[PDB]
Amino acid sequence: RNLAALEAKISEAKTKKNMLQARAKAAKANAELQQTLGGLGTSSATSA
Amino acid sequence: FERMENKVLDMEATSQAAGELAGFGIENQFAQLEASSGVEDELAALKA
Amino acid sequence: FERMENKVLDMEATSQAAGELAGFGIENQFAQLEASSGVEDELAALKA
Amino acid sequence: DPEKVLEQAVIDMQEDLVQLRQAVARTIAEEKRTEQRLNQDTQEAKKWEDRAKLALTNGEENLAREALARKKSLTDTAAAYQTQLAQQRTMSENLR
Amino acid sequence: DPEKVLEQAVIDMQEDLVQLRQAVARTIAEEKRTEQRLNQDTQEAKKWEDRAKLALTNGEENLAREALARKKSLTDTAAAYQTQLAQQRTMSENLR
């Protein structure tokens, strides 16, 4: 029974962290996309 | 997971900085864009 | 045999340390686990 | 000279659009995966539900309840993935 | 000569505006964090409230009252953070 319970802990603990890490990485990737769209620098040509 | 969670908060903090600066007079130009949008809707009514 | 017997008492002392710390709020989650267990029993009654 | 600066900014704009395309394409890939993931997951609960039906045939209520345990776990994951898929869809349109 | 002094003051003004932008950006970061902090905190009380509902199922009134103890602690923190968030919002507009 300890092994059966231990297996459940390992499986859920492993998978939940991975997906959390994946989505967290996805989150920053989306945020970077929004930041870059605002960070477009072609407006600097006004000096020219 | 705590380490990544802090990074998420950093992105949210960046979003706070990104969102707060977003406000500009350009918002008035969007009203012009929407005003022009009504013209095609008005023309769409003409087609109807 | 006396030497080994003392080691057994050491294990029992370790069990005392292990058992006393075992108590945690997780016990409440077991009630949820048993509560969910009743659902399948209720569904088992539905099958019956 | 403004000529060079204006030209350089134009050149820079060429780079930016490509990156956003990649980000969108990345977004397309992510949404597809969760779609694939959630779809199969929804079925697994049905499969274990069938394992319960075998239990419903005779005796092993434990197996039936066990099957429900997988059912409960899977549906929660589908809801979480369904929530995640919504974020990507919203984010995807934002970038689009 | 006033020409140099006037020019230098103009040059100095270039520095000042950048710093205030940073201060605002810092303010944006701070408000975001408390917003993030308070949002999750409000939910934790609900989570422990659920732990009480398990206690409500059978017996452990202590657990229910214990859950309330976390509930009371969390809501007080949210109010304090809510008060703190108000200060940043007022300060943010002041700098703006």
Curated annotation (Swiss-Prot), chains D, E:
Signal peptide: none
Effect of loss of the gene: Essential, it cannot be completely disrupted. Cells with very low levels of protein have no ordered thylakoids, are barely green and are non-photosynthetic.
Known role: Required for thylakoid formation.
Family named by the database record: Belongs to the PspA/Vipp/IM30 family.
Subcellular location: Cell inner membrane
Name assigned to this protein: Membrane-associated protein Vipp1
Included range, full protein: 24 to 119 of 267
Coiled-coil features, chain-numbered ranges: 3-96
